[PDB]
Short mmCIF file of C-alpha atoms and ligand atoms in Angstrom, two decimals:
data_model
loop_
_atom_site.label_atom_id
_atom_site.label_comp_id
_atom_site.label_asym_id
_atom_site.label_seq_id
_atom_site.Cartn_x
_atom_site.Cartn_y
_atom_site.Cartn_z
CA UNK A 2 15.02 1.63 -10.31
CA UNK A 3 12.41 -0.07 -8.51
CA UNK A 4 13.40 -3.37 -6.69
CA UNK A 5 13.31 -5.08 -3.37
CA UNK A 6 16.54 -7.15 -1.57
CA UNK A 7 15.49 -10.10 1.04
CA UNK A 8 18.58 -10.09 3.80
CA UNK A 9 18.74 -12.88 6.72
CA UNK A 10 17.41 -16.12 7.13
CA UNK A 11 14.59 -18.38 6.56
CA UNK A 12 12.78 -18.62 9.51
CA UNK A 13 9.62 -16.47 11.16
CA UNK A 14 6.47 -15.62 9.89
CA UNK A 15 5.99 -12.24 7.21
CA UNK A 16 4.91 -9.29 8.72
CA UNK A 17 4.50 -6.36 6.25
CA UNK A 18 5.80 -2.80 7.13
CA UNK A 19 1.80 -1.33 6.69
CA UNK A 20 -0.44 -2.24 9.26
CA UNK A 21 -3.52 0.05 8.57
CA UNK A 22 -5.81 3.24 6.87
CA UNK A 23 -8.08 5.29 7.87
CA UNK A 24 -8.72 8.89 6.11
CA UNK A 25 -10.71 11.82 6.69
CA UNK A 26 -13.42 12.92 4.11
CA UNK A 27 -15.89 15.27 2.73
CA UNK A 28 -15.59 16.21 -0.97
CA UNK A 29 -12.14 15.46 -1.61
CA UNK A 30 -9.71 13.01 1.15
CA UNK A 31 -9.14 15.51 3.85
CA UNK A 32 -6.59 13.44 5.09
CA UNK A 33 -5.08 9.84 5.32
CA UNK A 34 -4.04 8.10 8.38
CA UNK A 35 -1.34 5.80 7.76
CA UNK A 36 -0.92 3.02 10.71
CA UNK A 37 -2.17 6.22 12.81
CA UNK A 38 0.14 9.21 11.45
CA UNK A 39 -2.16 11.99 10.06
CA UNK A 40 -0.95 13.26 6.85
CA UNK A 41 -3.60 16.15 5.48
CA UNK A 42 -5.88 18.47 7.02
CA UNK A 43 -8.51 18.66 10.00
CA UNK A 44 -11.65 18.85 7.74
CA UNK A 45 -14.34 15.74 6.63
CA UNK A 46 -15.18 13.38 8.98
CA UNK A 47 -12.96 10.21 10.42
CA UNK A 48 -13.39 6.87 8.47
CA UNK A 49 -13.10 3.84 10.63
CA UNK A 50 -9.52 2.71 10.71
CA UNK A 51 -9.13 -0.84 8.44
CA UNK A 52 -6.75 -2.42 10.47
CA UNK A 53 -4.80 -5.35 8.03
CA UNK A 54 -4.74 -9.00 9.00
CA UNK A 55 -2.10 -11.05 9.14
CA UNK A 56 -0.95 -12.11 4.82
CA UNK A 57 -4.02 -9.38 4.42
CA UNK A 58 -3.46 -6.90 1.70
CA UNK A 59 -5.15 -4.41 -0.93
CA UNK A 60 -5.93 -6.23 -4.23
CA UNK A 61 -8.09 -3.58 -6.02
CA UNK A 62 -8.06 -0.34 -5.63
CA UNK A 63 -10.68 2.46 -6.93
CA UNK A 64 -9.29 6.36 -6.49
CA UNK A 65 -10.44 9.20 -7.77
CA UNK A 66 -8.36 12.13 -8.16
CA UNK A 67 -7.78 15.63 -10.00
CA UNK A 68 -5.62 17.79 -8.01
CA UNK A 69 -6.48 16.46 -4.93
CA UNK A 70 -7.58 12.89 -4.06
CA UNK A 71 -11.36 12.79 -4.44
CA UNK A 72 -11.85 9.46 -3.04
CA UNK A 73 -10.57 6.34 -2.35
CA UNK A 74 -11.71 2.67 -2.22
CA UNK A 75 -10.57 -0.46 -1.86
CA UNK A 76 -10.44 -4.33 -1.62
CA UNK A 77 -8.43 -6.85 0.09
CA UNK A 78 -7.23 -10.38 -1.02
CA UNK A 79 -9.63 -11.49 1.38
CA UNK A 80 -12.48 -10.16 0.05
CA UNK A 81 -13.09 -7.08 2.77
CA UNK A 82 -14.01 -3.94 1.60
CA UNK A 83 -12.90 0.42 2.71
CA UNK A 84 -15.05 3.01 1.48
CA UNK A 85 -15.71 4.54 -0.84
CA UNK A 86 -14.49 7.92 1.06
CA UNK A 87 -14.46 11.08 -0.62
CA UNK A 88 -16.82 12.93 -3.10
CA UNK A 89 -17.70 12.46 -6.67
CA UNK A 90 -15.60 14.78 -8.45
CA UNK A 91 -12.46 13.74 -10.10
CA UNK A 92 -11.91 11.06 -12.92
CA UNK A 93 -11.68 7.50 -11.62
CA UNK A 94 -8.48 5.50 -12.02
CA UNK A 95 -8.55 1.70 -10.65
CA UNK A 96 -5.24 -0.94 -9.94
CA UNK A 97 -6.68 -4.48 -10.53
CA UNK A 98 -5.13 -7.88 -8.99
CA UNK A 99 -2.12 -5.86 -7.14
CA UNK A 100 -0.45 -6.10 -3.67
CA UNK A 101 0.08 -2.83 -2.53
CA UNK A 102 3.13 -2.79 -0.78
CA UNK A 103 3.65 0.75 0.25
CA UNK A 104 1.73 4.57 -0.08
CA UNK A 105 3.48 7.59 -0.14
CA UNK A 106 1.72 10.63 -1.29
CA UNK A 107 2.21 14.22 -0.63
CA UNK A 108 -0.76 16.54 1.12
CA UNK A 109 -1.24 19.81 2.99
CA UNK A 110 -5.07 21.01 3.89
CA UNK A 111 -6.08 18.14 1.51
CA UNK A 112 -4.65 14.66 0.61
CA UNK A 113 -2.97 16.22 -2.73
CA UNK A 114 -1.46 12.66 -3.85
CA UNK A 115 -0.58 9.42 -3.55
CA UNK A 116 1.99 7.01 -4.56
CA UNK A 117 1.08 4.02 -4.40
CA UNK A 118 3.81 1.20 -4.80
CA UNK A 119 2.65 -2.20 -5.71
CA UNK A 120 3.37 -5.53 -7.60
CA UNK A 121 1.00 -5.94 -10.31
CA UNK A 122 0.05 -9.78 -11.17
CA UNK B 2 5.92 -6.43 -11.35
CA UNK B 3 7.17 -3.91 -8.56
CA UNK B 4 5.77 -0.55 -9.81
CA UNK B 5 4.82 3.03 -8.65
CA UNK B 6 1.90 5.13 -9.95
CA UNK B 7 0.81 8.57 -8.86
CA UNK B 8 -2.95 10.01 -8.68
CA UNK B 9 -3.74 13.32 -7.57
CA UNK B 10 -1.74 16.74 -8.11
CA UNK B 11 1.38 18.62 -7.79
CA UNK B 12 0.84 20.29 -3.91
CA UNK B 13 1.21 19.52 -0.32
CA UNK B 14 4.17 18.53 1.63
CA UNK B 15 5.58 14.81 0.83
CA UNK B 16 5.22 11.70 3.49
CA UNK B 17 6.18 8.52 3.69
CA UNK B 18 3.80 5.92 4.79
CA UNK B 19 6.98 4.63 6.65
CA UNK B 20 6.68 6.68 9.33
CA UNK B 21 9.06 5.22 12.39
CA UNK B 22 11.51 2.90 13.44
CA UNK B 23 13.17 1.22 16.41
CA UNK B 24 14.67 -2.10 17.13
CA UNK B 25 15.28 -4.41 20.57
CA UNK B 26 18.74 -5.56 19.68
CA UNK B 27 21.13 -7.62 21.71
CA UNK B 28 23.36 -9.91 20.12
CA UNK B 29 21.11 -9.67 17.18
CA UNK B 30 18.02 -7.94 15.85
CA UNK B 31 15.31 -9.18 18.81
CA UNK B 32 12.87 -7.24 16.94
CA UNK B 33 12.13 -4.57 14.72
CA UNK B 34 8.93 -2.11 15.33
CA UNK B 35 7.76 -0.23 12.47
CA UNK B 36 5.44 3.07 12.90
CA UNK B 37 4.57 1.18 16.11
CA UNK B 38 4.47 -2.59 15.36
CA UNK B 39 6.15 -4.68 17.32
CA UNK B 40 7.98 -7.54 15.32
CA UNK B 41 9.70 -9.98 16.76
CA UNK B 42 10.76 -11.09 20.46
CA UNK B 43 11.00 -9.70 23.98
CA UNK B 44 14.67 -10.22 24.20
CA UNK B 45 17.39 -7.91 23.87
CA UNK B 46 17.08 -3.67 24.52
CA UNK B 47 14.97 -1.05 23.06
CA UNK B 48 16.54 1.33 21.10
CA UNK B 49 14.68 4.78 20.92
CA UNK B 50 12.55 5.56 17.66
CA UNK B 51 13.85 7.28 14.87
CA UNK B 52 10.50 9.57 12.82
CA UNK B 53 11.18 10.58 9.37
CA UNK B 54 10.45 14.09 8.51
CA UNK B 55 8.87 15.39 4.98
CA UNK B 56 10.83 14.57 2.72
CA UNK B 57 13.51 12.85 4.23
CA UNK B 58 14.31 8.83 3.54
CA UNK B 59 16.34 6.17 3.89
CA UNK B 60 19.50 6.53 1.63
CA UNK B 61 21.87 4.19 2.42
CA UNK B 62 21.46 1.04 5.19
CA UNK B 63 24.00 -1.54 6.58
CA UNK B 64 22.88 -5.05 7.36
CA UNK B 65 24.42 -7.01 8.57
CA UNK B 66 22.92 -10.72 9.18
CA UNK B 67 23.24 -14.56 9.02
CA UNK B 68 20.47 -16.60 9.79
CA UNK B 69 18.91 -14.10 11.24
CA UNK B 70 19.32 -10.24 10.98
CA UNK B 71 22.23 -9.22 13.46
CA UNK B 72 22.61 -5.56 13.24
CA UNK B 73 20.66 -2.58 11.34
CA UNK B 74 22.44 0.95 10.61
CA UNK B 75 21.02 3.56 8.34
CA UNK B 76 21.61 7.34 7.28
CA UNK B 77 18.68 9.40 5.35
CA UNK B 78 19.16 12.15 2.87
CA UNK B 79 18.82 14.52 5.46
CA UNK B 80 22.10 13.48 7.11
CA UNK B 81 20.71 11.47 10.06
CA UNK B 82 21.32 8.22 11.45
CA UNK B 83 20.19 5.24 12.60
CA UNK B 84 21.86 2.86 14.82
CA UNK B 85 24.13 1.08 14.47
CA UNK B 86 22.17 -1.46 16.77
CA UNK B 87 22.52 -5.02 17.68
CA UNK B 88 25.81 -7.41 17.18
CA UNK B 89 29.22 -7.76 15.14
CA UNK B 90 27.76 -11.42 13.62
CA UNK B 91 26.75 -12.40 10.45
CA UNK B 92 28.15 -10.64 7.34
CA UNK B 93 27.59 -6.96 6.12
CA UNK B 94 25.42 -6.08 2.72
CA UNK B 95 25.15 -1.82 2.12
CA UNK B 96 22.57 -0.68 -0.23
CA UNK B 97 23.88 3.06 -1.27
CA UNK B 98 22.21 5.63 -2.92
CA UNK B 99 18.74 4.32 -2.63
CA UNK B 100 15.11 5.36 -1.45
CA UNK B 101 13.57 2.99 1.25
CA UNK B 102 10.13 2.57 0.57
CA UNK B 103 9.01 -0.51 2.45
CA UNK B 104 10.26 -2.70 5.18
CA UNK B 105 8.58 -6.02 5.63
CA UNK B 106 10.21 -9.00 6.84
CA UNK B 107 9.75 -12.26 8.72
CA UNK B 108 10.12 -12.78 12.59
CA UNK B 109 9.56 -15.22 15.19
CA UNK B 110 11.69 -14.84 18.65
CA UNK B 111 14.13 -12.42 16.65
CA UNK B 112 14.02 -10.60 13.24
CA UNK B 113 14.73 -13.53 10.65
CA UNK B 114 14.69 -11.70 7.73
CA UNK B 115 14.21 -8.21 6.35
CA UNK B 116 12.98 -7.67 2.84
CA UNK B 117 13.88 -4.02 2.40
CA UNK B 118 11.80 -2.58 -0.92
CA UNK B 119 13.19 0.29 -2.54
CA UNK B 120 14.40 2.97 -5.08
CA UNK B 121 18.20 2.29 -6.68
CA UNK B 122 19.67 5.43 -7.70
O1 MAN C 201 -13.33 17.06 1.89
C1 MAN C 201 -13.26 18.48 1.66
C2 MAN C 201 -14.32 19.23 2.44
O2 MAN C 201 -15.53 18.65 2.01
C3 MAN C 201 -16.56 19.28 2.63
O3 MAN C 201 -16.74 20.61 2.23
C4 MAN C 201 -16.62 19.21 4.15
O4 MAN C 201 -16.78 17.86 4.53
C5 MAN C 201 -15.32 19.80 4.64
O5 MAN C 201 -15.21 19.63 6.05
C6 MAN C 201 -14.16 19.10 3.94
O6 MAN C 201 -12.98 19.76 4.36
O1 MAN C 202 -9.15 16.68 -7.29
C1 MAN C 202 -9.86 17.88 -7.03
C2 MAN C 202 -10.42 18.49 -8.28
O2 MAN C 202 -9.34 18.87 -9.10
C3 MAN C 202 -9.75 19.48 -10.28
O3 MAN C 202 -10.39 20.72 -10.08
C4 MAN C 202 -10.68 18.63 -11.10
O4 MAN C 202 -9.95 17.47 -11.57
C5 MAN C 202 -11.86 18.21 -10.25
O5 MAN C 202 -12.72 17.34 -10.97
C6 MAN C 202 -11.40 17.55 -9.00
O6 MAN C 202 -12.50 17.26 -8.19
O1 MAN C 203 -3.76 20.07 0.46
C1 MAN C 203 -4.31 21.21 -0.17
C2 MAN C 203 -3.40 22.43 -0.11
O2 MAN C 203 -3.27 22.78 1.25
C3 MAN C 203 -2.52 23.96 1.43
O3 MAN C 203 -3.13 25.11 0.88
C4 MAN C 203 -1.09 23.79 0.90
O4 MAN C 203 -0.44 22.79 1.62
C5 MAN C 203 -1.11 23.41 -0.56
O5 MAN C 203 0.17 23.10 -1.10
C6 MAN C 203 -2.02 22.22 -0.74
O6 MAN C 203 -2.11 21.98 -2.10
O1 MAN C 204 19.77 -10.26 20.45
C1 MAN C 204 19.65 -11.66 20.83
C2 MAN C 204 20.00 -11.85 22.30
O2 MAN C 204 21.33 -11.30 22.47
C3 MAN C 204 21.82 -11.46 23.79
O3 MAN C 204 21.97 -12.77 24.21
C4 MAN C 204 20.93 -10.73 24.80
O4 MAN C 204 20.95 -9.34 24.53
C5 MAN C 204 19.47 -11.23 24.67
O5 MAN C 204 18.61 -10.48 25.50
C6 MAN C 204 19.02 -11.15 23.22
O6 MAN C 204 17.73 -11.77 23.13
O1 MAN C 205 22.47 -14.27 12.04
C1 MAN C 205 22.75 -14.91 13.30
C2 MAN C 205 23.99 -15.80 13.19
O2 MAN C 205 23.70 -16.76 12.15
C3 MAN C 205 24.73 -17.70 12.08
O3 MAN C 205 24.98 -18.50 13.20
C4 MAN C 205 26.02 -17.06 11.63
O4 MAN C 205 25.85 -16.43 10.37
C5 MAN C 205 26.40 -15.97 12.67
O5 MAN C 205 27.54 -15.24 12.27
C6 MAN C 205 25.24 -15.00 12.92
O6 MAN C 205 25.57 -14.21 14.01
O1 MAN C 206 12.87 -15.72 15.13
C1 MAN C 206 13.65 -16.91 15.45
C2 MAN C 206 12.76 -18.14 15.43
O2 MAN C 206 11.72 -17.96 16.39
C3 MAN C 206 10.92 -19.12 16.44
O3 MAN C 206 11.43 -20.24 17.07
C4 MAN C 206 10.22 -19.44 15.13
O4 MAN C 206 9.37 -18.37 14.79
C5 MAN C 206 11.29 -19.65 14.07
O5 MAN C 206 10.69 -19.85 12.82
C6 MAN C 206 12.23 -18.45 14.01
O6 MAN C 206 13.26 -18.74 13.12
#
C-alpha cells in the first residue's frame, strides 16, 4: 500500500530526495541518469542534465514505451521543458497535473522501464 | 493521490532512483545527503554512504525524532544496515515491512523533518 509518513518537526525548508535527469538516446532511452547514477547502456548520445530547482518538479509527463522506453518528455510546474529524447516508435502514454515524487525503473543495454511514483491532482 | 504506474517492458536489472545515503549526526540528525545532496547543516560528523544495490531497499527504518530528527537506523531486504546514527533524544517510530521509495524532508541548520514515502507490506 502506497503512502508516505512525515516524522520530526516543523521547521526548515523542503528539499525533495530527486535532484535531477539526464538520459542517453538514440531510438529507444539508452539510459537514464538519475541525480548522476547511470542506469542503462553506453549507446545514444548524452542529454543535458535538467538539474531541479528548489519546490521545482515534473507536472506532465509524455513517454513512449513498448518493451523498452522509446522516449521521454517532460514539464515542470514551472513551466521548463526536457526533451523529447528517444525515437518514434512505441505508443505514447502521458501523466497530466502530477508531482512526480520518485522513478524507479528497471534497464540493462536499454532503459527497459520505469516506475514512476507520483501524486496525481 | 500517491500512485505508481509502469511503462516499458518486462527486462533489465531493477534500480532505485534512490541511489545513496549518509548523514552528519551529532546529537541529532545535522544533515542528511541523499545520492549526493547535502541537506542540512555543517555541524555534527559524517557518517560514510550507504549505495543500494539492484534490487535491494529499504525494509524497515527507526526514527527517532522530536522537533527535529535525532537519529536514523535502517536495514534493507538484503540484510544490511544503516546506522544507527545521531542521538538517544526524541521518541522512536519503526516502519516494518515496507519499501522506501522516496525521502524528502525539510532542513535548515539540522534535519527538521523527514517525510519518508513508501510501500506498506
Ligand atoms: O537508442 C538505441 C540506439 O539507437 C540508435 O541505433 C543509436 O543511437 C544507438 O547508439 C542507440 O544505442
Ligand atoms: O519499446 C521498444 C519497442 O518495443 C516493441 O517492439 C514495440 O512496442 C515497438 O513499437 C517499440 O518501439
Ligand atoms: O535493456 C535491454 C536489454 O539489455 C540486455 O540484453 C539485458 O539486460 C536484457 O534483460 C535487457 O532487456
Ligand atoms: O547533532 C547536533 C549537534 O550535536 C552536538 O552538539 C555536536 O555533535 C554538534 O556538532 C552537532 O551540530
Ligand atoms: O528532536 C530534538 C529534540 O526536540 C525536543 O527538544 C525534544 O523532543 C528532545 O527529546 C529532542 O531531542
Ligand atoms: O534546522 C533547524 C533550524 O535551522 C534554522 O534556524 C531554520 O532553517 C529553522 O527553520 C530550522 O528549524
Amino acid at each position: 500500500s502506497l503512502t508516505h509518513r512525515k516524522f520530526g518537526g516543523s521547521g526548515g525548508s523542503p528539499f525533495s530526495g530527486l535532484s535531477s535527469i539526464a538520459v542517453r538516446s538514440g531510438s529507444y532511452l539508452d539510459a537514464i541518469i538519475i541525480d548522476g547514477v547511470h542506469h542503462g547502456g553506453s549507446g545514444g548520445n548524452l542529454s543535458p542534465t535538467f538539474t531541479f530547482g528548489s519546490g521545482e518538479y515534473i507536472s506532465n509527463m509524455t513517454i513512449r514505451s513498448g518493451d523498452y522506453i522509446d522516449n521521454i518528455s517532460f514539464e515542470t510546474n514551472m513551466g521548463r521543458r526536457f526533451g523529447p529524447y528517444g525515437g518514434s516508435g512505441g505508443s505514447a502514454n502521458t501523466l497530466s497535473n502530477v508531482k512526480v515524487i520518485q522513478i524507479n525503473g528497471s534497464a540493462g543495454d536499454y532503459l527497459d522501464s520505469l516506475d514512476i511514483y507520483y501524486e496525481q491532482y
